[model samples]
Every structure is written in C-alpha cells, then in structure tokens.
Target: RKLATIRTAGEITPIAGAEAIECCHVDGWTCVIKKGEFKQGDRGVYFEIDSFIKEDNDRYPMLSKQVIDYEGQRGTRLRTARLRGQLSQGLFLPMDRFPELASNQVGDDVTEILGITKWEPPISTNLSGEILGEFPTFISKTDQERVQNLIPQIEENKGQKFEVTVKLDGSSMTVYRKDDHIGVCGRNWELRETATNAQWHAARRNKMIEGLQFLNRNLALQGEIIGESIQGNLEKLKGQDFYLFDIYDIDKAQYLTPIERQSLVKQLNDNGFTVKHVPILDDLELNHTAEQILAMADGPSLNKNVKRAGLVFKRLDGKFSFKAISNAYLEKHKDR
Candidate 1:
C-alpha cells in the first residue's frame, strides 16, 4: 500500500510490515520510525522518523549515507542512539519474509526496533506473511570468495523441495495501468513514453494483463529488465531479459502471488515474450548466518561476467518475504 501523504515529517502510523519498504520510488532509502514513546517490543504501525547523526565515515558506507539522508549535519544524537541501541539500521518486524538476510529476522531483537512491535519478537509463522519495516533494498558489503563454495552446496542440496532459477541482472521497472491511463517508471522515478527506451517496451511485452482486459486495463505490472543496453557491466547478459518478480494493482494496491505471477509470465511467453523467474531454492540448509549467504555469491552463476550479486532467497510456498546477499557478505575471498 502507498504511504499516506506526509504533510509534515513527524510520524506515520499503521505502516505495513508485510514487505520491506523499498527505495523503488526514490534514489535513497525509506523506513518506518518511532512516533511516540513506546516501550521496546511494542506492536503498532510504521512511522518515518529523522535520520541518525554523527555517523562515522569509515568502513560502513551504507551507515554513513543513512545518516546523511536523515540527520544531515545536525547533532550526532541519532548516531549515538544507534550505536547505543536506541536506533536501528532500518524499521523492521520479526517475520521471516527473507531467509537469505540476517537483517530481516522476525526475532525478539528486531520487533523492539520496529516500534509498532510486540513484547515477544514475532517469529516467522510461515515463509510468506513476513513483513519488513524499512530498509535499503540492497547492501554493498559482501564476500565474493566464500560465496563460491556455498553455491555448490546449495546446488547439490537440490531435490523435490529445491527450486532454482537463473539470476538476472537488470534495472527495476514498474508500470501502473490504473484508472484510465498508464504510468511507466524506472527504479525510482516515472519515465515519459519515449520511442527509444527499451525498458518501457519490456513492460509492454510482458503481457501481464493479457487475457483479463479488465485486469490489464486496470492493473500495474512491476519487474526488472536485464541484458544489453540496460546498465552497469552487461558483458554476460547476452540476449537481455525481464526478470519479473512482482505485479501490483495500482488501484487495489495488491500483488499477485508468486505462483499466479509465474502463470502470467508463462502466458506472456506463449504470446512470444522473454521473462525470467527470480530463483527459489530449498533442501540445502539455509545459511542464515550473514557470512554464509554472502559466501555463496562467488559461484560461477552469480559471478559470471555480469554484475551478478546473488539470488534472492524466498520460499516456494510464496510464504517468505524476499531476502538476499552479495557473495561478498558470506564469501571469504581476498579480492572481496
């Protein structure tokens, strides 16, 4: 759901913890912050608060940027609070929306940080139904060397419970077909319909709204487009692809289930379109430890001559929120 319009920046309650607040709409980060005085482990909604101040300009770039994004050059109060355990990296809840991340655990410690939390940290009940408070979509720290070793373990662990898809590198593009018109977008901003933009063409070709004219005429299709002419290093992308993983209904403000979404992609394939599935794996024990997840990124599949980081670990049941890591986080290689 869209956040309520913020006339003044104080607090916005009732924030949904269903998914991590993504920076898909802005070039920076987004999160829910504390509204008022509430004990740790209280449960409520999300609120946007000020950023941390006095952050160190050392090893952690993410931490530094977060401070600047919110606190500016004000007091170091936010930074001190964060260091003292008064603040956190992002607003969050304790549901396992993403198993691949150490940052999104639905454990006791996290609930306290989300503000609208409960006394008992919300344990992940199902793989899906997990919620994210507020956090950056991706982090830059990862271990490429170790990630290489973990990939084989995961691949070997493949069985009836394991499913895997090729990870694609692309820019996120969302198309909103609502009311009487359509809105196209890049990662964070809407784009005008120009003849030269292939991203726009990617959305149009997805055919997500194909048969259901009622739905297509009134829904939003969201996905990332990969391959040549996209962004970053594209030496490995070859033919290009749209690694679609989400579809949103601008009016309904809802998303299609992973399965339903896959069905739609298949339909598009029938109509002669290329779509990529975000991989989901099982069987092998999940390396919940941040180190292990990062270690697995060095695998050939992910480290191919492209800008591959790692796969987003999600549940086949569509029961888990999305979680991911760069090979660097887990792998213990010298270059990384």
Candidate 2:
C-alpha cells in the first residue's frame, strides 16, 4: 500500500539532446529529474507513478496537467511517460527540501506523512450491485502485492520455485458457498443478485450454486471476471467470463496449494462444471534477479491482439502472492 518512500538513486545520466533535464535509476524504475538536481547515491523520496499528489500550484506547477477530481478532491496523479524520448516512471525529490522528513531513514515509507494516495479508477455501475453486507469474514479477499514493493521478499525467496500465471486485467469476483447459503461478491462487498449485476449473471450463467452444491463443501472461489465492457476489454474477449485463480477452504481456513487447487478444479470439471482456471505459464525456479523477473512481464497476450497486462507469481511451497505489471503496458497510455 505504500506508494512513496525514501530510496537511493543508483546512477545519474544526462539526456542526449536535452541539457536542462536528466534521468536516474531507482530500483526497477527510472525517473526524470532536473539536471544537477540529484547526485548519484542520493537518498530521496521516490513516489511511484500511481501516486496522486494533492493540488498545490505553488508546490507543483509542473503537474497541472496531471490534475483530476479524484474522489471529489482535486489533485494531480503521477503517471508514466517519455521525457526526451527516455522512459521515466514515477518522481524523485530531494529529502533535504523537506526538513520535517530529516528523521526518516533510507527505505522508510512516507506515503501517509506526505498525504499521498493511490489513484484508483472508478467501478462500473453494473459491477456495483446492491450491497448485502461487507465481504464475508470467513473468506480471504483477493490481494496481490506488487513485485516492486517486495524487493526484500523476492531477495530472500531466491532459490524457491514459484508458479507463474497470466494476470488477467479485470474486476475481482468471489463466489462462496457456506452450508446451504451460496452467494457472489465483488472486491469488497457481498452483493444482492441485482438484474444488472455481472457477478450474479456470471453465477447463473455458470451454474455456480449448483456446482458448489455438487461438491458440497464450505469453500470460497476467487478470480478475475474478464471480457466484454471490462477494463476496456483488454483481452478483446467477446462476452464476459470468470477465470478461477484461487480456491479457499472456508472450513479449513486456508488457501489450497497450487497442486491441491489444480486437482480440486479437475474434480469440479470432471463433475460437469466447465471451470476455466487462470492460465499458468510454468513452475519456475527463482534463479533470476528481480530486474530479470520484472523484465519478463512485457510480452504478448493469449488473445494475440495486445500485450499482456503483466504476470503473477505464487510461491510453490506456500503463497505466490507477488505481481509484476508491464512497464510496456503503462507506456502505451498517454499519462502525465
């Protein structure tokens, strides 16, 4: 959840033609900086591209074009773009410029201290059904930590094997059956089956209740619902469909391992439920460095028309909960 923090700049390099601006490396990202603004090895506040800076023309006049009415508050959203033909992601500012942050150490998170917030797009009305209640307490909601934020975790996880999958760009969907009760949920709320609710239609279209009852176990199924009118139809899918990525055992209070989930999905399919699970790329050994792994995120999609959003990695022995988004995908958008 931390999008901005103190990070050490790796290398300072000047642009080929531009004399007033330069670029520097910060971890897996490259950021544009004013010429002579920062020296190599400088520890500065690195704000990721998705961060939204509050409006203050005196402080951020250059960011006027990035302004938007986010959640009713006007602010500027940081974004990926080319600076002098050089790809730059995120922003870097000197720490000494803000004396109040003098006590913060390198790698310390200052997202909240600086009042920065993530820029999240709005949910569609059809996807936002009438709320029955908050998401069930028994089931775990879908959550994936970005690989950029898990540098240390990835460093320690070297040598371990992980399951990699194509991360579909879509809305979150959860279907759960607890005893005789069966229902569908969006990301955060359990929804009543409204006429326009895609989750409800998905359940009915796939016979989710019947399928769960056939298995007759307390379980929660989570995954992405992709296709028509969703996330600009990234996959170019014609109609909407659900792809299972996680199977949670409500009774046991734990998520199934990859093998366990695969076998269970086989059972569901063998029982006449044509369940389409998330596409698995391979079981890979973690020998590659973070930069190498992140670089792998840019590639063609299953649909053949566009590049994939990114890839998701799950630890084979435990939880493979890390995601790496494609820098290639972000650069396609004309954001500032």
Candidate 3:
C-alpha cells in the first residue's frame, strides 16, 4: 500500500499541439494536442496506462460514459459498460432466437480471482486486457490517512512536489524466499498453475527468479505485471511479457530504492524477464503529466507505450505507507 510518485526521466514530447487532441472510443474519433502537458495546470503528473470496460463477458474499448468498480476479491477493479443491450427477438433469425430483454437472472460469465459467476444483474463486465484507466486512479492504499486517500490536507498552495513513475497495469505478484522455501502469489494470494490460470500464470512464465535461490529471511520482491494479459489494447505486447518494478524484504518490511531494485533484476538476468524503468521526471505538474501520458495511450494496440491500469505514484524519499487507502471491500449493488 506504500504508493509513491515516480517522475519520468528522459526527453518527453512537449505540450503544444492542442488542435491535435481529440476524444476517443466514438465513431469518427478525431485527434488533437494539448497546449500544455498537464491539464489546466498544477494537477500533477500522472502515470498513464490502458484500460477498458466490459460487456456480456466480451471485451470492448470504453470511453467516458463507461462505469468501473472494484470487486475486492482479487484486488482489482471490474469495469463494465454502462449501456444495457437488447437481445434479438423473434425466431426468424436462428432456432435459438430470443427476446432482446432476457430474464434478469441471465448475465455474462466472468473469470475473476474469486472464480466464475453468472453476470450479476445490473450486468457487470471485467475489461479484459491491460489498459491503464484514468490517471490518479486509486491503486494500493497507504497507512497515512490523508495521503492514502489522496486528500491534500494543506489548504494553501505551497507547491510541494515529488518525483513520478509510470504505474504499470499488470497483475500484482510477489516472490519470497521464506524459511528456505519459495512462495509466489498473485497479488492477493498464492496461486497454483493450471492452463485455465493463464492470466496470473502467464506472469510467472517470465521466470522471475531465474533459478536463483534466496534465504527465507533474505529477499522478497513484488511487482506489477504489465503486458498482453492485462492491457492488450493499449500496447501490443506480444504474448505475456513483464517487467520488475519493486524489490522488497518481507522480513524487513522494506522495499529497495530504484537503483537497488534495478540491480537485483540485473543480477537475475533471465531473458524471459524485463524491467520497466520509465523516465523519471522531477517537480512537474501532477495533472498535466497524467493527461499527457494518457494521450500516448493510443500507442498502437500491443506496442511499447505501456498498457493497463494507471500510474503508480510514490514519494522519492520513501515517505508513504500501505494503509492509506485500506477499506473492507463490500458494496451491495441492485443488479447483484
């Protein structure tokens, strides 16, 4: 839950093409650019990723009108289209032709961390594939109440700033060497391998450990799995590719610095694995950066522009905690 801001390093496209910016997901989608990198000004830089809303178990590109919420089962938000579709009526079509308005019980099938269930009434959909949704979208929680909720307690504008990093929209994974045994988990819990467990398992195939052994109390690492399985529409990441972003020690309850994290991944140079070290920017506008990265989301489905979820922010000085956004996941919906 220690969410922090990481700045983008390296040359970035300057903001100046407002006319080129355009709204997406609608027919005749047009493009335009913004006069500035961050929207309005002073919003803060955002780590952008690709995301989508779902319908009837089928995945589709989503826009502003779509609705999204977290089920809290596997620590991920389930996205669904806000529109209600009508079933075809009359038997003239196919023998199985049915009315557009089917029974309330009928719904789509979704595969989530908690197993499959009939699409709940209100009809929900899990946007499959990695597409980072909106910027500053809530991810992990911090122990700090104000910071965890992202509510600035200060009333006046002191312009206190921090570094920012692109939040990878992949499955949360953990690898630990505890008491001489290695344990791997799918963000929320340890998982077993099965052909059907492709999404999470695909993240494992990267051989994150690379035959390296660690003492139980020695090393533990957690990272975001950003690739085809999570955000297929955002960037064309062939098959399931991933990068290591976090390194930790469960016993110590501390994460390594950026340099330290990268060093560890380098020590275990397995070809199947890669590290997503995005550019680090400093003291930039939060909102401006967030929208600018979102603009690049059109980076050709499955390409390198980063797909799935939104930015993972953190304080460069390691000044945040994990309990900031903790909440009991429970929401009763009329459709459910």
TM-score against native, each model: 0.45, 0.92, 0.43
lDDT digits (tens) for residues 1-336 of candidate 2? 678899988888889999999889887677889998899999999889879999987766778876888888999888878888998888898887668898889989899998999887667657888999989999988888877667678888888988888888889999999988998999999999878889888877876667889989998888898888877778888888889888889998888888888888898888888778877887888877667888999887667678888898888754657888887887774431
**For model 3, where is the 10-residue window of minimal lDDT?**
86-95
Residue-by-residue lDDT tens digits, candidate 1, 251-272 = 5444555666777767766766
Question: Is 2 or 3 the stronger prediction by lDDT?
Answer: 2
lDDT of each: 0.39, 0.84, 0.34
Pairwise TM-score winner, candidates 1 and 3? 1
lDDT of 3 by residue, 3-41 (tens): 112112212233233343211211111111122322221
Q: Which segments of model 2 are wrong by more than 4 Å? A: 334-336
User: Any runs in candidate 1 off by more than 4 Å, and if so which?
Assistant: 1-167, 204-218, 238-241, 249-252, 279-290, 302-307, 317-319, 329-336
- Misplaced by over 4 Å in model 3 are 1-148, 151-163, 199-204, 211-217, 229-233, 270-309, 321-336
Candidate number that wins on lDDT, 1 or 2: 2
Candidate ranking (TM-score, best to worst): 2, 1, 3
TM-score of 2: 0.92
